[PDB]
Amino acid sequence: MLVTGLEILKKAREEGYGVGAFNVNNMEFLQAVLEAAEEQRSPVILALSEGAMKYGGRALTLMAVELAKEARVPVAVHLDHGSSYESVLRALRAGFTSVMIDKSHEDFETNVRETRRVVEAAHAVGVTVEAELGRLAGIKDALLTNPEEARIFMERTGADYLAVAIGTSHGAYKGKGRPFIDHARLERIARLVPAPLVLHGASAVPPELVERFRASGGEIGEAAGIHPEDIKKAISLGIAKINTDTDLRLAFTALIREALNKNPKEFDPRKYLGPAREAVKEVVKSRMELFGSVGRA
Amino acid sequence: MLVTGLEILKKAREEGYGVGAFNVNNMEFLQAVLEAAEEQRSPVILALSEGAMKYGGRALTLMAVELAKEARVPVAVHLDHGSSYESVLRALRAGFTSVMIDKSHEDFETNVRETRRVVEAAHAVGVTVEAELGRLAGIEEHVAVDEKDALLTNPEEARIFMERTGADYLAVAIGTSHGAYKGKGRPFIDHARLERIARLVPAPLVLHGASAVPPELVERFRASGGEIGEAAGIHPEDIKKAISLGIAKINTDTDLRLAFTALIREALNKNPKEFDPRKYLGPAREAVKEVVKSRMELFGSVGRA
Ligand SMILES: [Co+2]
Ligand SMILES: [Co+2]
Ligand SMILES: [Co+2]
Ligand code: NA
Ligand code: NA
C-alpha cells in the first residue's frame, strides 16, 4: 500500500529497525526493489533522484506510485535530494508521498527558510519531508551534524525526518578502508531529535561485488562502503532510513557485462537485463536482512 | 490517445500507409517508441509478446496502457502472438485494445475455432483482434502449383477464414521468413498473392517476420563485439509496395533489439569505469528511437496523426 515516508519511518524508529530507501531509475530496478520487499514482507522506500526524474520521467513516476498502491507491504515514493522548491512541486505533482529538500550546503537560516517553505507545501498535500543538516563528508567538530542545532533545525522547519552527517558520503569510494562513523554523535542527536533519522551514502560496496565487477571488465579504484556493523548500530541508535544506490548500480552493470562477454550472439535485452535485475533484487533482500526489516510489513 | 487497433489500421489502409507495431519489453523501449511517434506525428502500435507480458508484467502493461492515453498521437496496445485463450484474457484484463491469437500452426478448423473464441471475448469488451493464416489448408480444395504456393496463404482461404472468425485484421504468409515458409527459401514478398488476398479481404492486412535489418545496423552490432549470421530482411521497396497493396500493420522488433544491444556494447567497451545504468541505457534508448522514426518514415505514417 502507498503510504507517507513518516508512517514508515516513525514505526521503524519506535520498533528499532531500519527501512531501506533504494534509488531506482527504470522498470527493472523498480521491479527488483518491490519484489524483494514482497518476498521479505518488508516495508520499503522507492527513491527517485532528480536525475531519475529526468531519465525516467512520467513512465517511472507512474510506475512508482501506482505499483506502490498494489504492493502488499507499505511503500513510500520518495524524492531523493530535491534541489529546489520547484523540483519538490513536481514531485508533489507526480504523486510522491515523501520528499527531501537538500540545502545542507547552505547556511543555517537559508537551510531553515528553504526547508520550511517545502514543509508547508508538502504538508498542505499530505506529503512528509526529509531535510539535511550537516555536510556528508569523510571521517562537536568539522561539518558533521551538531546535536543542539539539529533539535533547533527540526523545531523551526517542522521537517518529518532528518538526514545527518556522521561520517558517510556518496560514491563507491567512501573511505580508505573501513570509514569511521561517529556513533557517539549519532546518539547525542537522537537524544534531542525524536524524529526518525536518515543516513545518506550508506551503500556497503562489499569487496566481492567490486571483485565481481572487475572480473566482468569493470574498472574501479579502492572502493569501500559503510561496514555492516556500523549500520546495525546506527540503526539501534535511531537511524530509520538507509539510502542505497551505488550497490544496486554495481550489481546491475556487473551482470550485464558478464552476459555480453559470454554471449556475443545475444541481442534479446531480456537475456542480459533479466539476470542483472535479479542480482539487484538479491542485494535489496540482503540489505533488508541487515536493516532488520524482514517480516516487518 | 488510446484507441483500438482497428481504428488505426482501418484508417491506414484506406489512406494507403502502414503503421508500425513495435515490440517493447521495458521502460526505455516504450519511451523510445512513443517519443518517436510524437516527433513523427504518427499513429503507432505498442506490441507486447508473451515474453514481454512475462518479463515486463504489470509494470510494462501499466506503462503501455497509461502512457498511450496521454500520447498526442493515436496509440493502440497490442498482444503480439498470443498462444492461448487465457493469454488473451490476461491481455484484455490489462487494458489492451488489440489482441492477437496465433493458431496458424494448427489445422484450418482448429484455427477458426480458436480464433472465433478470441474474437467473441475481445469484441465483448470492445477490443479488436488480429488472426493469422499461413499454410494452404485445402478447404475449397486447392492444389499447390508451386512449392511455395503450398506454404504461403491462399487468397480464397483467407476470405473464408475472416468470414468465419470475424477477425478485424489479418496477418498473411507472403514470403517473409516466418512460419511454414521459415528457413524454406529466400525472403521476399509475393505481391501478386498479396494483391489477390486484398481483393477478397477488405480488412487491413498484417505483415510478420519482415525487418529491414539494414547493413549499417548489423555492421555496428558486429563492430561492438556482437556476432550474428547473414541476416536477410525484406527490401524497403517491397515493404513500400506491400503497404501500397494493403499491408497496414508491420511488426518490428529485431531491428530495435539490435540497435539497443549494440549501443550498450559500445558504451561498456569504451567506458569500463561506468556503472551508472543511465549512461549506457540512455544512448541505447535513443538508438531505438531513431530506428522507430525511420520505420515510420518508410511506412509512410509521418503526419498521419
Ligand atoms: Co544521499
Ligand atoms: Co545526501
Ligand atoms: Co505470425
Ligand atoms: Na533522501
Ligand atoms: Na501480432
Side-chain angles (χ1 to χ4, degrees), chain A residues 25 28 55 257 260 277, chain B residues 55 261 265 268 278 285:
Chain A
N25 287 267
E28 30 288 274
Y55 183 82
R257 280 181 159 281
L260 298 181
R277 169 224 262 157
Chain B
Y55 179 83
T261 295
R265 280 179 170 279
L268 292 181
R278 298 167 309 207
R285 169 219 273 150

Side-chain angles (χ1 to χ4, degrees), chain A residues 11-279:
Chain A
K11 182 181 177 291
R13 175 163 178 175
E14 176 72 13
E15 285 168 51
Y17 65 89
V19 171
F22 301 85
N23 293 85
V24 297
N25 287 267
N26 66 15
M27 188 192 81
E28 30 288 274
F29 274 72
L30 204 152
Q31 289 175 313
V33 175
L34 289 182
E35 295 184 18
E38 296 280 5
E39 298 184 348
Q40 298 293 221
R41 309 188 319 290
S42 156
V44 65
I45 298 179
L46 298 175
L48 289 69
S49 64
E50 301 188 322
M53 219 74 171
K54 176 185 175 56
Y55 183 82
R58 165 59 168 158
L60 219 207
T61 57
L62 167 67
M63 285 189 290
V65 173
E66 294 307 307
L67 299 178
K69 300 179 179 172
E70 293 179 339
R72 295 188 89 70
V73 310
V75 178
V77 178
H78 179 81
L79 196 219
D80 195 350
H81 299 140
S83 63
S84 62
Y85 181 70
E86 299 83 345
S87 175
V88 160
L89 288 184
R90 295 183 225 112
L92 264 28
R93 172 73 172 185
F96 280 36
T97 61
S98 176
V99 298
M100 182 221 177
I101 174 64
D102 183 6
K103 290 295 178 176
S104 54
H105 287 292
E106 225 58 59
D107 62 20
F108 202 80
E109 291 308 307
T110 304
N111 191 356
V112 168
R113 182 176 55 252
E114 301 263 53
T115 295
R116 177 54 189 178
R117 187 152 127 77
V118 158
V119 169
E120 286 157 352
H123 281 190
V125 293
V127 177
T128 55
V129 346
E130 178 191 308
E132 183 166 348
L133 179 70
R135 294 131 218 275
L136 307 166
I139 293 186
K140 183 191 101 48
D141 77 3
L143 259 209
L144 298 182
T145 303
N146 181 284
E148 288 65 28
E149 295 180 2
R151 182 191 67 83
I152 293 173
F153 184 73
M154 289 303 273
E155 295 182 355
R156 290 224 276 149
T157 59
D160 301 283
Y161 16 109
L162 178 64
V164 300
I166 62 178
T168 69
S169 56
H170 309 305
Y173 305 107
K174 256 62 158 174
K176 57 177 183 297
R178 172 165 182 172
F180 178 87
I181 303 309
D182 200 318
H183 290 289
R185 185 185 287 287
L186 206 206
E187 172 170 41
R188 296 175 205 288
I189 300 172
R191 176 149 281 98
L192 304 171
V193 180
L197 302 178
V198 184
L199 239 191
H200 290 202
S203 277
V205 192
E208 60 270 15
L209 182 61
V210 172
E211 153 267 309
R212 182 178 190 173
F213 179 55
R214 292 215 185 85
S216 71
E219 310 196 321
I220 187 173
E222 227 46 65
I226 293 62
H227 188 85
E229 237 71 14
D230 282 308
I231 278 164
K232 289 191 291 188
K233 179 153 194 168
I235 292 177
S236 62
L237 291 180
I239 296 298
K241 184 175 173 293
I242 306 73
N243 299 5
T244 304
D245 192 346
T246 293
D247 283 357
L248 306 193
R249 292 151 89 150
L250 284 179
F252 193 76
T253 301
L255 271 289
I256 292 187
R257 280 181 159 281
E258 314 188 331
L260 298 181
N261 288 337
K262 179 173 181 176
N263 320 290
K265 307 165 52 180
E266 185 65 68
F267 59 86
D268 177 342
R270 296 163 302 190
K271 293 295 168 296
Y272 48 79
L273 257 28
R277 169 224 262 157
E278 259 294 312

